[PDB]
Amino acid sequence: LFPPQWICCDIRYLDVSILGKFAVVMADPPWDIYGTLTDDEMRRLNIPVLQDDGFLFLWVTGRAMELGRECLNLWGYERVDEIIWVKTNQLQRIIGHWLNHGKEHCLVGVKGNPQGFNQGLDCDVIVAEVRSTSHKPDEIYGMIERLSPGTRKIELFGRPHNVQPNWITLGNQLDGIHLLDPDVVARFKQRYPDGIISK
Amino acid sequence: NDYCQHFVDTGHRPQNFIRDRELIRLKDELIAKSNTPPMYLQADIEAFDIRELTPKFDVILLEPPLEEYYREKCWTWDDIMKLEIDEIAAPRSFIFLWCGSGEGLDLGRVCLRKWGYRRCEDICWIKTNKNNPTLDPKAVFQRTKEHCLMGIKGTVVDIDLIITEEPEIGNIEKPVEIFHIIEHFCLGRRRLHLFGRDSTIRPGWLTVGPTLTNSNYNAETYASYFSAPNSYLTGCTEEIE
Ligand SMILES: CNc1cc(N2CCC[C@@](O)(CNC(=O)c3ccc(CN4CCC(C)(C)CC4)cc3)C2)ncn1
């Protein structure tokens, strides 16, 4: 279980019920503001099966600030926090047509009643350097791990550099399938005997 | 490197380590030269018929006193949502709504849509704690910022960040820098600040709030500042001779 795991797939079509339940879900969707997903495709994502009790981290920008709130609620979450990442250069200087944008937003949703999470350890501002285009700061994984140490986590629309211990990463630019958790391996084989993920 | 870990280790917020042409001052001078006299009216906004404020405004800054501001009479989002802000907004106009850090980030967006605006910017007031390295039950993280949402209605420089030190307990003032950002947009000269205070009164603004100690507002005098030939100035151009 513990080492990084991933599935190259089209998240619209993967049967995510084979993955089990997660303490934390993070998504960095290609909002329709690379290839994108339509608003309806985002709404229809089977996020509700991924968790019983825990937190969702949902990166948003532009009009997805609103559309992401719609999806969050549709999927069964209440938005209880909002992280902002202040983007700096290597010298800690800060790097929408009315104002220049110094930050990215990450909505934080809760589902059910999570118990045993370390709420309040971190604050809701990240100061970190822009790495490359569309690369989120690695600090978010540390905040999430301190909030929920040792638990199962899943990232949607991640790239190879996003794979992390305790996480399963889904995205269509990953290299193949790499699954180590025996429960997931078993359910994947049953559901996908020939290893193909289509409709 | 990892300022989040550092905050966990030391209590210094990550924004404490953010660090840090020459023409954005003739603009400031033009703004200053075009500003109307400061005007202000003490009014219990809940009991006040908002329609007595005329004419319709180009910019509305709305700063309702939320309960979360008094951690250690407040307005609920129920109260705020029931304001008839669309009745005093010009068909082309802007709003800046201080929403706090909790449920107002959602309910303030409901308000903007109810009043007929679309959100076009999300301005974050990030509070440092350099001088001093309690959670809402629903909070997952320590809340160290407030949001001021900018909304636009009708058809159609700075950064969306204000960084200052967290005020002392009991201080509800928002950073005056919000006025600079607003005025730098050059949106027109009829500017309303609802729930302002004696301390926020400012040239170029009509300030309306329950705690003001004095009033000088006269609707006819105020309207006279914008009568022809000055009906459509941006607030950033020279006065008409
Ligand atoms: C069609 N169905 C799919 C699509 C799919 N994608 C579609 C191709 C790209 C994909 O491979 C990897 N994601 C990205 O590159 C990507 C690009 C931009 C953003 C926006 N964000 C950037 C990071 C931020 C924190 C700065 C804030 C803003 C997020 C992710 C996933 N994955 C599975 N199924």
Swiss-Prot record, chain A:
Region Positively charged region required for RNA-binding, annotated ranges: 93-101
Record region (Gate loop 2): 130-138
Tissues expressing this chain: Widely expressed at low level. Expressed in spleen, thymus, prostate, testis, ovary, small intestine, colon and peripheral blood leukocytes.
Binding site for S-adenosyl-L-methionine: 10-11, 28, 136, 159-162, 172-173
Subcellular location: Nucleus; Nucleus speckle; Cytoplasm
Effect of residue 161 to A: Slight reduction in methyltransferase activity
Residues with site note (Interaction with METTL14): 66, 69
Post-translational modification as stated in the protein's UniProt record: Sumoylation inhibits the N6-adenosine-methyltransferase activity. Sumoylation does not affect subcellular location or interaction with METTL14. Desumoylated by SENP1.
Result for mutant: residue 155 to A: Abolishes methyltransferase activity
Inducing factors: Overexpressed in a number of cancer tissues, such as lung adenocarcinoma and colon adenocarcinoma.
Record note on what altering residue 10 to A does: Abolishes methyltransferase activity
Effect caused by changing residue 34 to C: Found in patients with large intestine cancer; uncertain significance; does not affect interaction with METTL14; abolished RNA methyltransferase activity in vitro
Quaternary structure and interacting proteins, as annotated: Heterodimer; heterodimerizes with METTL14 to form an antiparallel heterodimer that constitutes an active methyltransferase. Component of the WMM complex, a N6-methyltransferase complex composed of a catalytic subcomplex, named MAC, and of an associated subcomplex, named MACOM. The MAC subcomplex is composed of METTL3 and METTL14. The MACOM subcomplex is composed of WTAP, ZC3H13, CBLL1/HAKAI, VIRMA, and, in some cases of RBM15 (RBM15 or RBM15B). Interacts with NCBP1/CBP80. Interacts with EIF4E. Interacts with EIF3B.
Family of this protein: Belongs to the MT-A70-like family.
Domains (record comment): Gate loop 1 and gate loop 2 regions are adjacent to the S-adenosyl-L-homocysteine-binding site and display large conformational changes upon ligand-binding. They may play an important role in adenosine recognition. The interface loop contributes to the heterodimer interaction.
Identification of the protein by name: N(6)-adenosine-methyltransferase catalytic subunit METTL3
Portion of the parent chain present: 368 to 576 of 580
UniProtKB/Swiss-Prot annotation, chain B:
Family: Belongs to the MT-A70-like family.
Domain of life: Eukaryota
Region (Interaction with METTL3): 19-20, 101-102, 119-122, 138-147, 157-160
Native organism: Homo sapiens (Human)
Main location: nucleus
Subunit and partners: Heterodimer; heterodimerizes with METTL3 to form an antiparallel heterodimer that constitutes an active methyltransferase. Component of the WMM complex, a N6-methyltransferase complex composed of a catalytic subcomplex, named MAC, and of an associated subcomplex, named MACOM. The MAC subcomplex is composed of METTL3 and METTL14. The MACOM subcomplex is composed of WTAP, ZC3H13, CBLL1/HAKAI, VIRMA, and, in some cases of RBM15 (RBM15 or RBM15B).
GO cellular component: nucleoplasm; nucleus; RNA N6-methyladenosine methyltransferase complex
GO biological-process terms attached to the record: forebrain radial glial cell differentiation; gliogenesis; mRNA destabilization; mRNA modification; mRNA processing; mRNA splicing, via spliceosome; mRNA stabilization; negative regulation of hematopoietic progenitor cell differentiation
GO terms, molecular function: mRNA binding; mRNA m(6)A methyltransferase activity
Ranges where the record places region Positively charged region required for RNA-binding: 109-118
Protein task: The METTL3-METTL14 heterodimer forms a N6-methyltransferase complex that methylates adenosine residues at the N(6) position of some mRNAs and regulates the circadian clock, differentiation of embryonic stem cells and cortical neurogenesis. In the heterodimer formed with METTL3, METTL14 constitutes the RNA-binding scaffold that recognizes the substrate rather than the catalytic core. N6-methyladenosine (m6A), which takes place at the 5'-[AG]GAC-3' consensus sites of some mRNAs, plays a role in mRNA stability and processing.
Keywords: Differentiation, Nucleus, Phosphoprotein, RNA-binding, Spermatogenesis
Site description Interaction with METTL3, residues in chain: 106, 109
Cellular compartment(s): Nucleus
Outcome when changing residue 44 to A: Little or no effect on S-adenosyl-L-methionine-binding or methyltransferase activity
Disulfide cysteine pairs (residue numbers): none
Residues of the full protein shown: 117 to 393 of 456
Name this polypeptide is given: N(6)-adenosine-methyltransferase non-catalytic subunit METTL14
